[PDB]
Curated annotation (Swiss-Prot), chains A, C:
Disulfide bonds: none annotated. Residues 1-141 form the Globin domain. PANTHER family: HEMOGLOBIN FAMILY MEMBER, HEMOGLOBIN SUBUNIT ALPHA. This is Hemoglobin subunit alpha. Changing residue 113 to H: In Twin Peaks. It holds the Pfam family Globin. The gene is HBA1. Changing residue 74 to G: In Chapel Hill.
Curated annotation (Swiss-Prot), chains B, D:
It comes from the Eukaryota. The record marks 59, 82, 95 as: Not glycated. This is Hemoglobin subunit beta. It comes from Homo sapiens (Human). The lineage of its organism: Eukaryota, Metazoa, Chordata, Craniata, Vertebrata. Changing residue 24 to V: In Savannah; unstable. Pfam families: Globin. The modification N6-acetyllysine is found at residues 59, 82, 144.
Length: 141, 146, 141, 146
C-alpha cells in the first residue's frame, strides 16, 4: 500500500529516469540473468548475451509496463490485468524472481542516479516494485 | 562461497576502494529507512523518526562501521564464511532472534549502496560476484538457525 | 489481489466461524506462541499460559478485525488504517510474524472446519490473510 | 531437530494413524493449488488446470506417497536429518533449483493436512512438535545451498 508520499516520490523519480527507462529495464534484466542464473530458465528462446537485441527490446517492454503502472498507481490491478494473467496464470513465475528483478532494478537505478537516489526515493521505489510484483503474481480474474 | 578467480579478483579490486568509515552506516541506515520494522532492534540508538535523523544518527554510523568490518572479514575468508561468522550468527540468531530474511535484505541494501558509490564501475559481472558474497554472508549468519 | 472467487470463498468459510471468533482467534494465538516462541516477545506484560484470560480476550479482537476485514475486503487499507498504524508504525512487527499467525489461523480453521477447508478455500484464505498482513505491515499513513 | 521425549511420542503416535496412501498426495496437491507457481516444477504430471484436476491427478497422488515416505524417514532419524536427506538435497537444489522457501511451504501445507485430518487431536502442543520436524526437514533439504 503506497502512501501519498510514496506516490509522489515514485512519479518524481521515474519522471527523472525519463527517457532512460527502457535502457534501465534492459540493464536490470542483464543484471538479473548474470547474478541469478536460475532466472534464465524463463527465457529459453532468448539470446541472453550481453547487449543482445532481444534483452534490450524486452527491457523496453518491462519499462513501459512500469511507466504505465506509475501512471495508474491508484488502480494497478485493473491496469496490469493482462500482465498479471501472463505472469501468474500462464508462466507460473515463482514470486522469488520478482524480488530478484526488483532488486536488480533498484541496483540499476542506484548506479545511474548518484544525485537522485535518496533513501526516501529508494524506500518508495522499493514499495512500488513490491506492489507491482504482488499484482503480477496474483491471479485475480 | 564459490567465486571464480575473475570474481574473487574483481570483488577485491572494488572492496579496496570502499570507504570503511561510511558505507556500513549508509547500508544500515537505508535498511532502517526502507524496512522500518528493523528499527525495532535499535531503540537504544536514538532518533530514527525521519530519513534525515536515520542517515545522520551517530550510533547508526558507528554501528555500521562494525557491520562493514564483519563484511571485510568475510571477504578475507571467502572459503570459510560459516566459521568466520559463527560468533555473529550466535548473537543474531540465539540472542537477538533476528529473522534471517533480514540478513538477505541488509546484504542487498549493501549492494545498492555499492552501486550508488561506484556507478558504472559496478558492472553486472561485479554485481554478480558480490551477490555470491552477500548470500554467503547471510547464509553464514543464519547458520545457528540450521 | 483477491479474485471474485476468493472473496466468495473467504466470506463463506470465515462466515462459519461466527461466534467461535474469540475461541478460534485465541487458539491461533496459542498455537503461534507454542510453535514459534519468538512471537512472544511482542506481548511482554501478557499472561501467555494456556487458558490465559488475556490471550482469550486478545484472540477475540484479532478474530473480529478479520471479520471486519472480510466485510471491507474491497477497501482494506482504509478499514484497517488504525490497525496498520498500530502494527507497522507503533509496534514495528517484523513481517515474518504475520506469516506465522496466518499459518496458525489456517491450521485452526482446518482443525475445526473439515468440510469447509477444501483446497480452493484453503487457497483463498491464505491469499486473504497475506493481503491483510501486507496492509498491516505497510505504512501508508 | 530437538524433540523432547514427550514430543517424540506425540509425533510417533499421530503418525501411526496417518493414511500413508493419501496424506502425501493431499499435501503435494494442496501445495500446487495454494502456491500455483510450484506447478511449473510438475508439468509432466499432466492436467493441473483446476483445484479438482490437481487433487484428482494420479501422478500427484503417486508422487505424494514418495514425499510422505521421505518425511517418515526423517521422523526415524531426527538425529541425522541432514544426512538422511543428502541425496534429495542435491536433487532439489543442484538439479531442480527449487527456492528453499518452497520447502517451508510444503512442510506447512503438510501441517494443515494433519490438522484437517485429525481435527481436535492435532492440539497446539502436537503442532509445536511437528513444526520442528518439518522445519528440520526443510533445512536438511536446503543444506546443499548453504
Ligand atoms: C516488475 C516486474 C515485471 C514486469 C513489469 C514485467 C513485464 C513484462 C512484459 C511487459 C512482458 C511482455 C508481455 C507481452 O508480450 O504482452 C513480459 C513478459 C515476460 N515476463 Fe515479465 N515482467 C516482470 C517480471 C518478470 C519476472 C520476475 C520474470 C521471471 C523471471 C518474468 C518473465 C517473463 C517472461 C518469460 C515473459 C515472456 C517472454 C516472451 O516469451 O516474449 N517477468 N513481462
Ligand atoms: C547481514 C549482515 C549483518 C552483519 C554482517 C552484522 C554484523 C553485526 C556486528 C559485527 C555486530 C556487533 C557485534 C558486537 O560487537 O557484539 C552486530 C550487532 C547487532 N546487529 Fe547485526 N549484522 C548484520 C545484520 C543485522 C540485521 C539484519 C539486524 C536487524 C534487522 C541486525 C541487528 C543487530 C543488533 C540489534 C545488534 C546490536 C545490539 C546493540 O548493540 O544494541 N544485524 N551486527
Ligand atoms: C492476521 C493479522 C493480525 C490481525 C488481524 C491483528 C489484529 C490486532 C488487533 C485488532 C489488535 C487489538 C487492538 C485492540 O485492543 O483493540 C492488535 C494488537 C496487537 N497485535 Fe495484532 N494482529 C495481527 C497480527 C499480529 C502479529 C503477527 C503480531 C505479532 C506476532 C501482532 C502483535 C500485536 C500486539 C503486540 C498488539 C497489542 C496487544 C496489547 O498489548 O494489548 N499482531 N492486533
Ligand atoms: C519440503 C519437503 C520435500 C520433500 C520431503 C520432497 C521429497 C521428494 C522425493 C522423495 C522425491 C523423489 C526422489 C526420487 O525420485 O528419487 C522428490 C522429487 C521431486 N520434488 Fe520434492 N520434496 C520436497 C519439496 C519439494 C518442493 C517444495 C518442490 C517444488 C515445488 C519439489 C519438486 C520436486 C520435483 C520436480 C521432483 C521430481 C518429480 C518428477 O518430476 O518426477 N519438491 N521430492
Ligand atoms: C500497545 O499499544 C496499543 C496502542 C493502541 C491500541 O488500541 C487502539 C487502536 C489502535 C489502532 C487500531 N485499532 C485500535 C492498543 C490495543 O491493544 C494497543
Ligand atoms: C501496497 C503493497 C505493498 C507491498 O509490500 C510488500 C506488497 C503489495 C502491495 O499491494 C498490492 C496491491 C496494490 C494495488 C491494489 N491491490 C493490491
Ligand atoms: C492482493 C494481495 C495478495 C498478496 O499475496 C497473496 C499480498 C497482498 C495483497 O494485497 C494488498 C492490498 C490489498 C488492498 C489494497 N491495497 C493492497
Amino acid at each position: 500500500v503506497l502512501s501519498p508520499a510514496d506516490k509522489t516520490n515514485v512519479k518524481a523519480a521515474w519522471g527523472k529516469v525519463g527517457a532512460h527507462a527502457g535502457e534501465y529495464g534492459a540493464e536490470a534484466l542483464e543484471r538479473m540473468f548474470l547474478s541469478f542464473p536460475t532466472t534464465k530458465t524463463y527465457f529459453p528462446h532468448f539470446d541472453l548475451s550481453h547487449g543482445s537485441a532481444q534483452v534490450k527490446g524486452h527491457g523496453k517492454k518491462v519499462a513501459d509496463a512500469l511507466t504505465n503502472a506509475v501512471a495508474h498507481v491508484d488502480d494497478m490491478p485493473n491496469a496490469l490485468s493482462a500482465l498479471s494473467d501472463l505472469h501468474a496464470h500462464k508462466l507460473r513465475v515463482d514470486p522469488v524472481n520478482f524480488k530478484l528483478l526488483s532488486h536488480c532494478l533498484l541496483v540499476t537505478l542506484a548506479a545511474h542516479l548518484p544525485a537522485e537516489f535518496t533513501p526516501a526515493v529508494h524506500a518508495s521505489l522499493d514499495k512500488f516494485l513490491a506492489s507491482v510484483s504482488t499484482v503480477l503474481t496474483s491471479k485475480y480474474r | 562461497v564459490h567465486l571464480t578467480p575473475e570474481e574473487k579478483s574483481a570483488v577485491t579490486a572494488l572492496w579496496g576502494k570502499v570507504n570503511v568509515d561510511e558505507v556500513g552506516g549508509e547500508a544500515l541506515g537505508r535498511l532502517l529507512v526502507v524496512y522500518p520494522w528493523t528499527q525495532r532492534f535499535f531503540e537504544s540508538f536514538g532518533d530514527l523518526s525521519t530519513p534525515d535523523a536515520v542517515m545522520g544518527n551517530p550510533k547508526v554510523k558507528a554501528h555500521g562501521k562494525k557491520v562493514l568490518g564483519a563484511f571485510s572479514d568475510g571477504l578475507a575468508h571467502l572459503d570459510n564464511l560459516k566459521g568466520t561468522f559463527a560468533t555473529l550468527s550466535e548473537l543474531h540468531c540465539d540472542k537477538l532472534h533476528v529473522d534471517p530474511e533480514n540478513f538477505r535484505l541488509l546484504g542487498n541494501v549493501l549492494v545498492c549502496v555499492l552501486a550508488h558509490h561506484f556507478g558504472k564501475e559496478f558492472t553486472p559481472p561485479v554485481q554478480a560476484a558480490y551477490q555470491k558474497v552477500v548470500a554467503g554472508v547471510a547464509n553464514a549468519l543464519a547458520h545457528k538457525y540450521h
